[PDB]
Amino acid sequence: VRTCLPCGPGGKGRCFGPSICCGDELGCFVGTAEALRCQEENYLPSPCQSGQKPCGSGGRCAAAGICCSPDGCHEDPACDP
Amino acid sequence: VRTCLPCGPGGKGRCFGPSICCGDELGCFVGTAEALRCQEENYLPSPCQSGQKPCGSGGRCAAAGICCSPDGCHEDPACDP
Numbered sequence: 001v002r003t004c005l006p007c008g009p010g011g012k013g014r015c016f017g018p019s020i021c022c023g024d025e026l027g028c029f030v031g032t033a034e035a036l037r038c039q040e041e042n043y044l045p046s047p048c049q050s051g052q053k054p055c056g057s058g059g060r061c062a063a064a065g066i067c068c069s070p071d072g073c074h075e076d077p078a079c080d081p
Numbered sequence: 082v083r084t085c086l087p088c089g090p091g092g093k094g095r096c097f098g099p100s101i102c103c104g105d106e107l108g109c110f111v112g113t114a115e116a117l118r119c120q121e122e123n124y125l126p127s128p129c130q131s132g133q134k135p136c137g138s139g140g141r142c143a144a145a146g147i148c149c150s151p152d153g154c155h156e157d158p159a160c161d162p
C-alpha cells in the first residue's frame with residue numbers, strides 16, 4: 001500500500017503512526033510538532049504503511065537502529081544499517 | 082535521585098535515555114539531533130532519573146500520553162495529562 005504522509009524537517013520524514021514521524025537521516029519524532037501532520041492520516045480512508053523491514057510486534061524499521069509501530073518506537077539492532 | 086541532563090528546544094526537555102529527549106511542551110525526540118546531548122549522561126558517575134510517574138515496563142511518563150524507558154517510548158493513557 002502507499003507510504004504514509006511525509007512529515008518533519010524538509011518533509012524528509014514519513015509517518016509511522018498518528019504521532020510518530022521518522023526518517024533515516026532524522027531519527028524519530030514521537031508526539032512532537034514534527035509529527036502533528038501524522039494525525040491527518042486518520043482522516044484518509046486508504047491504508048498506508050511506512051518503512052521496509054518488519055521488526056518487533058507490528059512495527060517496522062523507521063530509522064537507524066529504531067523500530068516503530070503506530071503507537072511507539074524502541075531501539076532495535078535488527079534495524080541498524 | 083538527580084534529574085538527567087537537559088536537552089532539546091530551549092533546553093526545555095530532559096534526557097530519558099542516551100538518545101531520547103522529552104519535555105511536557107515538546108513531546109519526545111528519539112534518535113534525533115535534539116537527543117545527541119543525552120549521550121553525555123553515560124559518562125556521569127551519578128545515577129539520574131527523569132519524569133515522576135512509573136509506567137509500562139521500567140518506563141516513566143515523559144510527555145503527555147507518552148511513556149519512555151531508556152530504550153524507547155510508547156503511547157500510554159496512564160501518562161495522559
Ligand SMILES: N[C@@H](Cc1ccccc1)C(=O)N[C@@H](Cc1ccc(O)cc1)C(=O)O
Pocket residue numbers: 004005015016017018019037038039040041042043044045046047048049070
Ligand atoms: N489512513 C489511515 C486509516 C486507515 C487504516 C486502515 C485502512 C484504511 C484507512 C491509516 O492508514 N492508518 C495506518 C496507521 C497510521 C500510520 C501513519 C499515521 O500518520 C497514522 C496512522 C494503518 O492503520 O495502517
Ligand SMILES: N[C@@H](Cc1ccccc1)C(=O)N[C@@H](Cc1ccc(O)cc1)C(=O)O
Pocket residue numbers: 085086096097098099100118119120121122123124125126127128129130151
Ligand atoms: N549517569 C548514567 C550512568 C549511571 C547509571 C547508574 C549509576 C551511575 C551512573 C545514568 O544515570 N544513566 C541512566 C540512563 C540514562 C538516562 C539519560 C541519558 O541521557 C542516558 C542514560 C540510568 O542508568 O539510570
